[PDB]
């Protein structure tokens, strides 16, 4: 219903805990959530009291993907302009998170489906509950894994695993999502918040600028030859010398 109620956050000891807040809608990404998520991310990004951002979810789902009703059906009733406006709101906040000034952590306690793979990839690190389920179910409602989700599967998991995942639309457990490197680690649900909290506290003790440059370098040198990446990392360090 209300746009500013679709995302909630709390800053505690330099950690921004951000939650998808449509628990009864399995935190489906609707245009209202997409717009409000950008608003919250943009406001938190450069605060000197935010060193780490954790993306969680309320209720049994982390994120059940895009809102079938509000993101797909309602926007397409407004024609191409409607579809484009809605796509842009989704892609824009996933990119804001992907290139965030502060280190980002996905805390995935529950269902992570489809369009949730953009935000999952956009988090630098990811920690899952054993009980979590990850799935590209798009094939199972007759569409391509969109919102970059095909590329997310290919950039994080081995090619055979990614192909099975996208084609068969079966779910991975938390432990399988760790084995195939969709996430960093899986543990029982009741240890997950303590582990994420520990990782956040470790990052805030490092030099914040050094952490920003390092996470960026990791994502960027993926799309370079070894030779070009060598020179790139020298130019980055000259940038960090200015910021530090």
């Amino acid at each position: 219903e209300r746009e500013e109620d679709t995302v909630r956050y709390e800053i505690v000891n330099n950690v921004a805990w951000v939650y998808y807040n449509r628990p009864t809608k399995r935190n489906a990404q609707s245009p209202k959530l997409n717009r409000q998520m950008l608003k919250v991310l943009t406001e938190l990004e450069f605060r000197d009291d935010v060193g780490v951002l954790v993306l969680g979810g309320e209720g049994p789902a982390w994120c059940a993907g895009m809102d079938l009703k509000e993101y797909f059906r309602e926007t397409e009733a407004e024609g191409l302009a409607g579809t484009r406006k809605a796509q842009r709101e989704a892609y824009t906040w996933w990119e804001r998170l992907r290139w965030y000034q502060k280190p980002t952590i996905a805390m995935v306690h529950g269902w992570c489906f489809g369009g949730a793979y953009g935000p999952l990839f956009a988090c630098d690190l990811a920690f899952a509950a054993d009980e979590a389920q990850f799935g590209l179910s798009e094939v199972n409602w007759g569409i391509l894994p969109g919102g970059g989700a095909t590329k997310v599967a290919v950039d994080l998991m081995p090619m055979r695993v990614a192909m099975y995942h996208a084609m068969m639309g079966e779910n991975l457990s938390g432990q399988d999502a760790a084995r195939y490197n969709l996430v960093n680690e899986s543990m029982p649900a009741d240890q997950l918040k303590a582990r994420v909290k520990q990782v956040a506290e470790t990052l805030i003790q490092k030099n914040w600028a050094t952490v920003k440059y390092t996470k960026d370098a990791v994502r960027r040198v993926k799309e370079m030859t070894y030779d070009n990446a060598e020179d790139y990392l020298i130019r980055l360090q000259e940038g960090l010398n200015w910021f530090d």
Copy 2:
């Protein structure tokens, strides 16, 4: 001896079971097999009663690579024109399978060596017998892993694993080929046909056009930046809207 006897198939319930059929020659890819495989693949590809193609082998080998006598020795006796004609027949059917209209499955019960890595990679999914052996033995007869096999090892397995595999010419078991993601899964031989049959039946229940676009997207977005892959998947879905 006879060109049309080097490959056999059977279509049962929308699954094309295709077998390398030179069991006494460990299903060596000879020019006769290469030509006949293209003929069989081309005829099956667009039949409305074929939803999935399974590539198996007769006898103890899946495929022991290229025929040393008929593919290498005899063709090179015909000079460059002979070598080129033979190369083209091999590369052409591997590409036909790589970009097949229908989902493809490798059922690897036995030996998979050398030139078999092109067809193995060209199958979207791969299931192995624990007893199967995978090897790049080229180094062990003084040649580079050709027919794209070096690239197959690098595109599916981690770089260190690929380097050991190509340089040392040692065999991986089925279970090791699963661990290193050369295949999706390994199981005892006597469960392998039941598992492959189950996977085929699951794919034929999906929208066939959606499965084609998804498998293609997986292979294609490997060779794109994240940013270019995002737009690509939007253009693909517009294509699928036309086909569906």
Copy 3:
């Protein structure tokens, strides 16, 4: 102190055993070691009695990265010319090893930190002691993982693993470095020299030219599309036909 004492070697039965020789300095890469390593590598490379090169270390470390005093502090006191001259000495011997005429093996018994990742990557194969520790500690002294180390982590390990490794500056054990494919294998320290010796003896029994072309092809086809890699491997084999 003395430049020619910072690296030692011994050739036994066609294996060059090369050691970082600053044990009391945890084999820190100083400009003296960088210069002497290039001298030793260049002299060994084309000897007909050297078929394999093993890179080890004296004392408890394999390589604790760059010498904080002699590589960073002292060179930067000589301004940009000093920094550039020192960088060039490091990058040049890592590249000499990366593209070496003979197969290369890292025997990592102990600490491998930071700037050691260039040489580790430049070795074709890598074998670790269970007791070995691998770490990008740069973040923990406020710099980017330089000397290509970010790219090394991204080229060998899965993206999530690489991101955690670079951002958190925690150590991987030998067994974890094997699991994540930073190295080929981990075993107890007291088996490591016997295993490396076995692998070296296996490579020297192969055709030396075939091993050189294969290791190069593995590294090169990483940075090509599948289609361009297919043609590339044909051109390489024409090159090997000339050398053999």
Copy 4:
């Protein structure tokens, strides 16, 4: 003064004629202009009566670059948050223009410096007056040609010409701009509008969907191998068959 006055537009014969509207400030790109350009472009893009958009300038400038006061000095005063907010507003409208639903034409009658190169490249076609002047004067102000302006130079002009243009900070005339393919055509100032009207009028008589898929194809296949581009153009036509 007023954000809403920094851009104006008129629709004539289903052509949107859009103008930088800060003539006394040489249509420098201020945050106000950047936010208003985005608004205007977003509002016109999916209008069924707008077939083509022309970007022009009031006064003796087309666009003299970024506003050195409002984009650089005033935003840096607000530290990194202010700089990033201002960069995002600039990059976002250049990108909206670069991927516009409708064909785009730059009508360059006068000065085109520095940050104007983004918008210049983001236009599909570009027609200059002979008395127009194009330059990357960045080097003379002691900064790199930013806002992608160095890449615009390298993507449009021969590498020697881009190198001279960027390093010497000297202006190209409309005639030289046309010679080095920064623009399509140069003509006397008094023929410029009529040629642009003619071109816009020819485009509007084509299938609008076809012109959109074509201009996107041209831009995209530049960052693709020939082989990948052949498949891509088939995927695109499948898309267009849905959209027509």
Copy 5:
């Protein structure tokens, strides 16, 4: 009528002069011509008395594009199988030409439209008459410039020029084609054959193996970084040392 009559050739002074042979149909590419061109090219390629191949056209056309009746309408009538069979026949002969063993020359005396761009690009060199006309008229028929023709435009001509050529569907004269480097040279129709004879005659006096490795190098190093291209050209010369 007859498939065998759609292409003719004559060998003169070890030059194969090959001609599109449907002059009354403006040498449009029908499936029949596509299958016969492949046959002819395959048969001439490894003849020890053919040093060079020239592609020409009978009648006022070089090639007016794909046969709108036989390639598009008649094949779509046979649904997707028919379309794919017809596309494969076109793409396959363009590719055979693009990677030909012998140097290739387009002799463009008249019309060169649309699908003719494949064969145009597949020729290593291209000489036009001044009265020749080149265009991508696709946009005026409401389709994308397919058959790789959009990539041919972007690969040969400056991006502004490719953009105008593709979007406006207007023709370039032989003189403008030469100016924008779609062809090497333009000359009056009555000098065309003599210049082509001269060029073919100069090529045949070179080491044929050297000319083949050189034209392939030029085409390949375009899709390589400078650094990767330096190593590649050394690998190529090792190949040529085997082949000479």
Copy 6:
């Protein structure tokens, strides 16, 4: 005879005028010249009184390519070790020049053949006399255009022009070299030095750090997508803000 005499230089108004100094041997690149060029370049690069380096030639040649006696015949006599040692010495100084700290200008008054293309490309700008001659005569000697010379042709000139240049081994005049953008400008021999002095003199009046970051940007963004290039140029300016 003497290694130290193969290169000379004079500093005038903070411009290093460096000359190939084997005029009787058409400044062919011998190992001696290769080792001495590196020495000279390394020694001048970080001098606070050298703002610009110009590369010229004594005698009627700029550089006629590699010394066929000292670089090819004498080194091959020492087998593979000798060939690799000689290649490394050539490639190493071209690279030092290509990434020089100071802006670089080729002053091409006469012959520029084959292996001279490395140094030609490694210069940021290039000014030719009208009576200069440029060619890849490699094909006429039966070798591929090596030393990256084929890539230099493809990177600087339109693909048709590179193809003709490489395949026909015919010379371009200074005027045609300027037309196809192998050099910036061509002028009568007696105006050449004065234009070069003027250009070097304009560069020295700029912020030297800005000119270095700019010329490197131009070279680097050519091997980047537009999207990756936009981010890269921001990272570079952060670097320059440290260095200024």
